[PDB]
Design a protein around this nucleic acid. Structure first.
Ligand SMILES: [Mg+2]
Ligand SMILES: [Mg+2]
Ligand SMILES: [Mg+2]
Ligand SMILES: [Mg+2]
Ligand SMILES: [Mg+2]
Ligand SMILES: [Mg+2]
Ligand SMILES: [Mg+2]
Ligand SMILES: [Mg+2]
Ligand SMILES: [Mg+2]
Ligand SMILES: [Mg+2]
Ligand SMILES: [Mg+2]
Ligand SMILES: [Mg+2]
Ligand SMILES: [Mg+2]
Ligand SMILES: [Mg+2]
Ligand SMILES: [Mg+2]
Ligand SMILES: [Mg+2]
Ligand SMILES: [Mg+2]
Ligand SMILES: [Mg+2]
Ligand SMILES: [Mg+2]
Ligand SMILES: [Mg+2]
Ligand SMILES: [Mg+2]
Ligand SMILES: [Mg+2]
Ligand SMILES: [Mg+2]
Ligand SMILES: [Mg+2]
Ligand SMILES: [Mg+2]
Ligand SMILES: [Mg+2]
Ligand SMILES: [Mg+2]
Ligand SMILES: [Mg+2]
Ligand SMILES: [Mg+2]
Ligand SMILES: [Mg+2]
Ligand SMILES: [Mg+2]
Ligand SMILES: [Mg+2]
Ligand SMILES: [Mg+2]
Ligand SMILES: [Mg+2]
Ligand SMILES: [Mg+2]
Ligand SMILES: [Mg+2]
Ligand SMILES: [Zn+2]
Lengths: 89, 43, 119, 101
RNA sequence: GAUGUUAGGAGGGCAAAUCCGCCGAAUUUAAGCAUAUAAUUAAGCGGAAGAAAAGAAAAUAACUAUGAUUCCUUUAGUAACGGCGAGUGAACAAGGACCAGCUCAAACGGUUAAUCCUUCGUUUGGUGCAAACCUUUCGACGGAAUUGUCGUU
RNA sequence: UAAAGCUAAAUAUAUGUAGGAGACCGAUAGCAAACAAGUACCGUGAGGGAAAGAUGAAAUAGUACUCAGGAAUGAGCAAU
RNA sequence: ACGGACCAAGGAGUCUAGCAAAUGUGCAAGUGUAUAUGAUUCUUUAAACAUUUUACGCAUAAUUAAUG
RNA sequence: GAGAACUUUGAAGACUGAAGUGGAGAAGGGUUUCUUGUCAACUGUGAUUGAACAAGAGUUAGCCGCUCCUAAGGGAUAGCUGAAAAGUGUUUAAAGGGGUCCCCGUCUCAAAAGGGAAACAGGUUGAUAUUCCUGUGCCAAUAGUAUUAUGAGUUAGAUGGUAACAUAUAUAUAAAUGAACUCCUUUACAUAGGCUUUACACUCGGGGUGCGUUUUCUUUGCACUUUACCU
RNA sequence: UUUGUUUUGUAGCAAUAGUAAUUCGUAAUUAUCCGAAGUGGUAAGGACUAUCCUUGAAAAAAGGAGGGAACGGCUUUGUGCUUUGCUACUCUUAAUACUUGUAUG
RNA sequence: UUAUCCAUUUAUAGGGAUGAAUU
């Protein structure tokens, strides 16, 4: 078999099993299965495992800007009432 | 190939933009380059 | 270059007019940039800033008007409501927390924790 | 049928949705576009990625003395739409080019 | 009982070190191994908070008796469990930290549900430059509720 | 005095943020990561996962000028 | 017989628990202030100091399966 | 060009030999395309070349696709399981459409080769073309009210033809009443075998044009002599 | 209105476009583009015939039929329906105008 | 038989004597 288990067979490797994943952006959305390998995309849930500590660390709350959360931090310290500015002049 | 989804096309464009070198003037005040043949975008 | 303190006094229509003019100017600058020019390429930034300022002024005016419109009246838009951490919103108001069953209240009134200096 | 005592969310801000300024960004030079302008009275504009043909037409009508017969568009690989705008026979793209700049 | 894009609201997801529920192994130890051990652990699934849980005795004692829970020092590697092998193993008392008690149900009040809530309001205040807040008692119009609200202990 | 319910404190904290300390480590160490590091890169994928600090006081002293060179460079009676 | 092409750096009896022996030290029928408190203790001080104006451990007695 | 066995042009000699290193596409790649530069590294020899490096540019659609349909299938709704996570998909549902209350009825995704509204030619760019240009069409929409015209029919719904069936030729065959409710058909189908018909290709002979051979021979050898969808 | 003869039309698209020529200028003119046939490689269609314990998708969408629901318009009177009086009507494409969100891709 | 269970359909007339079929 010219298309035998090694190099010949690597020629027949076209056609993605995974594409890009809405939600994770991580090219791990199993197309045929319609399920992301690193998310469980359609499952409303993130699919993280205590057995994968590295994995956990590489997608936690800190990793990526925190558009709103960051802004809200310091507010407690300030304890300013909402709607209130400082005094002018 | 020659029939992409819009998203994919946009990603490709983004990658291309990323590719280009440091604007030289900045150097007076890059390691993530990728050549299309040797390293894949893996999309 | 128009700074906000001038703009607060202006009426909304006037503000809008100003904004449109600024936008037009910006567009012109962009066009120039696109064409082989670098004469007033650096002018654009200032214009952009001005536009932003104008937008801010107008937006705040609008918000104020909205607030005036929905003064009191129990319910309000969720924008004009007290945007505040969800948990806090959920939480019982201090008064509610305080509220005592009548007997307990009576007890409290009668036998409050006294001050009593021991000697 | 809804009859809410007050509306849920009221964006009092000036609209974020793209006006003429913002929709259509700038004309193209480049030899191609110049050629187009010369030969077949088609003006080439770079536009926002989220411009429609209708929208672009409207923008052109508003931004200039232009009447457009047909608008072709395409998404460039630089994340811009390039809109080829063929003017009605009454107008000379060259004259309008001059007017714009 | 369905039905509603009815009016108003709530849940969903992220994060987890501590925390609460389940669910639940095996490597390992026993110089083998099967009960044991690992371990009521890891992983899995769910759920909270600035802490959680526990908590006001169907408790311990057998004393001259103590007196919610939690935690520390100890009791104690003890009583006990265990191919009584390997190994596992508390509790009370004692000394502290800290200390806080309570309300439903049931009993009672029918010369009358006194309760409670939604919507609409009304008019004294207080801090604020505004924004908002803060409280003040007064009715209506709705309902809820006698298949039980409120007071009394 | 079971078969209903609530409850602050002492207690815990390898998570996050912010402080402060050290008979700690000193770039093959210390976090995987002192640096555009969970980055590059590999894996279809679950995942795997680096290397890489130091001129000088000052580059607002980063190599002018001349000669030889196609140029790189080299040389200098030239220069910081 | 095996390992060693060369060189540089890294690179392996450690730390805790509890027991014992040895030796030092204190006090000695006692000893150890354990938690915790207290102080005119507060960069060091997360140490040091103190112990209320019969706690507990181990020892001071053994032996028995045991009431003892 | 500093420098040329492997850059370019010409002249030879060769090969690929229409089952092609030729034209088109799919998957995959992702700007590798294109021009202008250009040589530190890379282009396992050289290199002035390059799919390298740098600067810019480049992808135009009602008709080509996707978009719609359903297929093997997938994900869900109801429940029902399960501590949940998940596992099953009418199993005991009060599960949106069509007509003027009755009558139907899970939803959704799954084909860039199945089903399917409609496009052809020539020209044009450094790089795109059934996508731009010129020309010529085609398809589907096209709300109401009011005029206009166009033709039909009636003075409430044409005629012909024995029949098979035909007939609206108005700019354009537009119009031949038709509701509920039904019933068909198209969509819509295997493989083999030859037979036939047309187009395309190839070829032959003649006429016309040009080029080639010409010591000798050759009314000669070669090229071109074209015709699209649409009506 | 049907028969005879002739001249056109590459049936329209269409020669204005292509091709091969020929000149003339520093883009324009001209001449050409047409009379017979064979081979049966490829494709498609046709009518068939044969094989099967194999009989060879579905739906959107469209069409046809069956059926006979409903039925002119305007004006006047009474509570969408009934009565009374008059004759241009019901379709049908195309254009045009006007309000209704800006009524073509 | 009423629990339970199975089947059947649009949950379609209570038990006995090779056309059309709908308002
Ligand atoms: Mg697959
Ligand atoms: Mg692809
Ligand atoms: Mg490759
Ligand atoms: Mg397009
Ligand atoms: Mg949750
Ligand atoms: Mg063993
Ligand atoms: Mg062993
Ligand atoms: Mg074994
Ligand atoms: Mg766990
Ligand atoms: Mg609690
Ligand atoms: Mg204890
Ligand atoms: Mg002991
Ligand atoms: Mg155990
Ligand atoms: Mg209790
Ligand atoms: Mg509790
Ligand atoms: Mg390191
Ligand atoms: Mg040997
Ligand atoms: Mg050996
Ligand atoms: Mg060796
Ligand atoms: Mg070695
Ligand atoms: Mg000793
Ligand atoms: Mg070579
Ligand atoms: Mg050959
Ligand atoms: Mg050969
Ligand atoms: Mg190229
Ligand atoms: Mg080389
Ligand atoms: Mg080049
Ligand atoms: Mg490149
Ligand atoms: Mg098509
Ligand atoms: Mg559908
Ligand atoms: Mg199916
Ligand atoms: Mg499923
Ligand atoms: Mg689909
Ligand atoms: Mg198809
Ligand atoms: Mg090309
Ligand atoms: Mg011609
Ligand atoms: Zn994902």
């Amino acid at each position: 078999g010219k298309a035998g288990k090694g190099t010949g067979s690597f020629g027949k490797r076209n056609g993605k099993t995974h594409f890009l994943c809405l939600r994770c952006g991580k090219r791990s959305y199993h197309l045929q299965k319609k399920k992301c390998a690193s998310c469980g995309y359609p499952s409303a849930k993130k699919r993280r495992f205590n057995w994968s500590v590295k994995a956990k660390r590489r997608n936690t709350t800190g990793t990526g800007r925190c558009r709103y959360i960051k802004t809200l931090r310091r507010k407690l310290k300030n304890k300013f009432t909402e709607g209130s500015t400082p005094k002018p002049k | 190939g020659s029939i992409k989804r819009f998203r994919l096309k946009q990603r490709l464009g983004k990658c291309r933009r990323q590719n280009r070198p440091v604007p030289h003037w900045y150097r007076l005040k890059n390691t993530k380059r990728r050549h299309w043949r040797r390293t894949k975008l893996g999309l | 270059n128009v700074k906000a303190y001038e703009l607060r006094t202006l009426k909304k229509k006037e503000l809008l007019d100003k904004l449109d003019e600024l936008k037009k100017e910006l567009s012109g600058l962009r066009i120039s940039k696109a064409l082989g020019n670098s004469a007033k390429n650096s002018k654009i930034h200032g214009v952009r800033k001005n536009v932003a300022r104008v937008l801010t002024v107008y937006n705040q005016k609008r918000k104020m008007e909205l607030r005036q419109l929905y003064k009191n009246k129990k319910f309000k838009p969720y924008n004009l409501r007290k945007k505040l951490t969800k948990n806090k919103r959920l939480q019982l108001s201090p008064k509610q927390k305080a509220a005592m069953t009548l007997r307990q209240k009576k007890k409290v009134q009668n036998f409050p924790q006294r001050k009593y200096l021991v000697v | 049928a809804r009859n809410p005592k007050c509306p849920r969310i009221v964006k009092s801000c000036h609209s974020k949705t793209l006006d003429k300024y913002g929709l259509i960004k700038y004309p193209l030079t480049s030899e191609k576009a110049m050629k187009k302008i010369e030969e077949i009275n088609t003006l080439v504009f770079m536009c926002d990625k989220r411009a429609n043909k209708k929208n672009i037409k409207k923008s052109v009508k508003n931004l200039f003395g232009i009447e457009c017969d047909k608008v072709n568009v395409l998404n460039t690989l630089n994340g811009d739409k390039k809109a080829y705008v063929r003017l009605s026979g009454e107008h000379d793209a060259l004259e309008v080019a001059n007017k714009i700049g």
